[PDB]
From Swiss-Prot:
<feature type="domain" description="Globin">
    <location>
        <begin position="1"/>
        <end position="147"/>
    </location>
</feature>
<feature type="binding site" description="proximal binding residue">
    <location>
        <position position="93"/>
    </location>
    <ligand>
        <name>heme b</name>
    </ligand>
</feature>
<dbReference type="GO" id="GO:0046872">
    <property type="term" value="F:metal ion binding"/>
</dbReference>
<keyword id="KW-0963">Cytoplasm</keyword>
<keyword id="KW-0349">Heme</keyword>
<comment type="subunit">
    <text>Monomeric.</text>
</comment>
<dbReference type="GO" id="GO:0005344">
    <property type="term" value="F:oxygen carrier activity"/>
</dbReference>
<dbReference type="GO" id="GO:0015671">
    <property type="term" value="P:oxygen transport"/>
</dbReference>
<comment type="similarity">
    <text>Belongs to the globin family.</text>
</comment>
<keyword id="KW-0479">Metal-binding</keyword>
<keyword id="KW-0514">Muscle protein</keyword>
<dbReference type="GO" id="GO:0019825">
    <property type="term" value="F:oxygen binding"/>
</dbReference>
<dbReference type="GO" id="GO:0098809">
    <property type="term" value="F:nitrite reductase activity"/>
</dbReference>
<dbReference type="InterPro" id="IPR000971">
    <property type="entry name" value="Globin"/>
</dbReference>
<feature type="binding site">
    <location>
        <position position="64"/>
    </location>
    <ligand>
        <name>O2</name>
    </ligand>
</feature>
<keyword id="KW-0560">Oxidoreductase</keyword>
<dbReference type="GO" id="GO:0019430">
    <property type="term" value="P:removal of superoxide radicals"/>
</dbReference>
Length: 153
């Protein structure tokens, strides 16, 4: 799994995120939607937003960015023992939203991009590799539950 020093670097940069969760949530979703527009079709509340400018202006989008990063934060803080927190997210994303594992990779990359852009001093090479393995672990564990849930992500 991750070493203790790898989780520390994950939680250090997550502290930066938590100092402005709304701004981070908003930039992550914009990067996702602009880089991979097919992801935006999953969002009945948003899919009409056609441009970055419209997305920045969207209060609903910003609130959803908060929801998404808040959940991922709870998961990352559980380090290697996140089964409990992961369970309900796999559930809704396998039944209600149907989010393919590929879309979770896209948002993992969007998070790494935003973290590198906004916090380079807390997101150097080692920290970026640690967050990479942490998001891989998140995806692999979701994918395992998807299969139980009967969703081929």
């Amino acid at each position: 799994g991750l070493s203790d020093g790898e989780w520390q670097q994950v939680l250090n940069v997550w502290g930066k995120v938590e100092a402005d969760i709304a701004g981070h949530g908003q930039e992550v979703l914009i990067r996702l939607f602009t880089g991979h527009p097919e992801t935006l079709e999953k969002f009945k509340k948003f899919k009409h937003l056609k441009t970055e400018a419209e997305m920045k202006a969207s209060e609903k989008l910003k609130k959803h960015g908060t929801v998404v990063l808040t959940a991922l934060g709870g998961i990352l803080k559980k380090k290697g023992h996140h089964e409990a927190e992961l369970k309900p997210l796999a559930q809704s994303h396998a039944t209600k939203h149907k989010i393919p594992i590929k879309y979770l990779e896209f948002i993992s990359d969007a998070i790494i991009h935003v973290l590198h852009s906004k916090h380079p001093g807390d997101f150097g090479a080692d920290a970026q590799g640690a967050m990479t393995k942490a998001l891989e672990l998140f995806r692999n564990d979701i994918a395992a539950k998807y299969k139980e849930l009967g969703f081929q992500g």
